């Protein structure tokens, strides 16, 4: 038996956590917070024919910059061709990495209610010398039947690599909506 | 008598539906998802004197592109002069249309707590040949006393026309914050 006051308390705490980037964890991969993509060491951006800006000025693609951007309506993803691809992000701050968060559009928002283009198995690599060969921080697999946002728990790093090894079966590309990196700053 | 666990379950389901574009329906009119406006076949954009960018470079208006954009803070609307006006959007995908969704700023956010500039009676038209004279998919009237977001239930189409026949009484213009089109893709 729960009282009214305890219902108001439970929703107020739940809207606070919602308002706190949905999962209440600082994101050191968040561009506005001062992170950037090593655009040279990212997978080739699948750009193809699609979006023209007019008056035909210009063909529109999605830079990998967006995987570090919060807006995750459908289409606001970075897309590479095939089921393998990678990105190297310089975190806003040298931290000891404790978790990553991946997120895809909800099925209810995506047509035919399937999210074929989402990443399946991925892996995370630290790069001690920003310079070096990656140190495997951990492998995980994003769960197409899971929630849109899923966070995954595992030395300080400022450069990290999200490596996607498989996708959930799209024959042409893989979309990455948002990638996050959590952890504690050094002492 | 409800238990704690059932309160947590009910709010978790409610925040999921909230996070899912508020109503959990794919939007084939959503630009980022690959929809566009037939800018030639849209009502004349009421632009008047208002917003200058400096150093006076430039006068700022709101393209009809925004009615297919999610941001719905006050002012992020497309505005035409008078109480009649129309827009033709090419849906991201040929679908059999089953519903549309209109949405206006909440009264609590709008000054003097009234939303005089909102659309009243509207209508929806398919255009089989993207080319053709519209096929009336259904008439509805947006309810100024309703909720900000209101969705309305009714052949495949990719081109659809939102036709506004009256507004809720603004003497100068009508603002359109967001227009959505739901349905099922063809087989």
């Amino acid at each position: 038996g729960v009282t009214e006051e305890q219902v108001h308390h439970i929703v107020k705490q739940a809207l606070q956590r919602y308002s706190e980037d949905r999962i209440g964890l600082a994101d050191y991969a968040l561009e506005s917070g001062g992170a950037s993509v090593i655009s040279t060491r990212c997978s080739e951006t699948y750009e193809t024919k699609t979006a023209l800006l007019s008056i035909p000025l210009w063909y529109h693609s999605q830079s990998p910059r967006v995987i570090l951007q919060p807006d995750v309506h459908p289409g606001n993803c970075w897309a590479f061709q095939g089921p393998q691809g990678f990105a190297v992000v310089r975190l806003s701050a040298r931290i000891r990495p404790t978790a990553v968060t991946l997120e895809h559009v909800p099925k209810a928002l995506s047509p035919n209610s399937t999210i074929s283009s989402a990443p399946k198995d991925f892996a995370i690599f630290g790069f001690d010398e920003d310079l070096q060969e990656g140190t495997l921080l951990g492998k995980f697999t994003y769960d197409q039947d899971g929630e849109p946002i899923q966070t995954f728990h595992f030395g300080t790093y400022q450069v990290v690599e999200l490596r996607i090894l498989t996708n959930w079966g799209h024959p042409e590309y893989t979309c990455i909506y948002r990638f996050r990196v959590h952890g504690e700053p050094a002492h | 008598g409800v238990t704690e666990e059932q309160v947590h379950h009910i709010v978790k389901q409610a925040l999921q539906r909230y996070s899912e574009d508020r109503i959990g329906l794919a939007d084939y009119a959503l630009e980022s998802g690959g929809a566009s406006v037939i800018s030639t076949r849209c009502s004349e954009t009421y632009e008047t004197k208002t917003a200058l960018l400096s150093i006076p470079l430039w006068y700022h208006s709101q393209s009809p592109r925004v009615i297919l954009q999610p941001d719905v803070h006050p002012g992020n609307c497309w505005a035409f002069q008078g109480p009649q006006g129309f827009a033709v959007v090419r849906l991201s995908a040929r679908i059999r249309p089953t519903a549309v969704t209109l949405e206006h700023v909440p009264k609590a956010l709008s000054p003097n707590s009234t939303i005089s500039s909102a659309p009243k009676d509207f209508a929806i038209f398919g255009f089989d040949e993207d080319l053709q004279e519209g096929t009336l998919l259904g008439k509805f009237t947006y309810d100024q006393d309703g909720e900000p977001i209101q969705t309305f239930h009714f052949g495949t189409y990719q081109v659809v026309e939102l036709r506004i026949l009256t507004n809720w009484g603004h003497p100068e213009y009508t603002c359109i914050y967001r227009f959505r089109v739901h349905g099922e893709p063809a087989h």
């Binding site: 699948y46 699609t50 000025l57 283009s117 | 208006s61």
Partner: peptide, 15 residues
């Protein structure tokens, strides 16, 4: 004086 950049889709974008 009033501006507008046009967006159109020749194929469905990555989604």
């Amino acid at each position: 004086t009033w501006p507008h950049l046009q967006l159109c889709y020749l194929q469905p974008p990555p989604v």
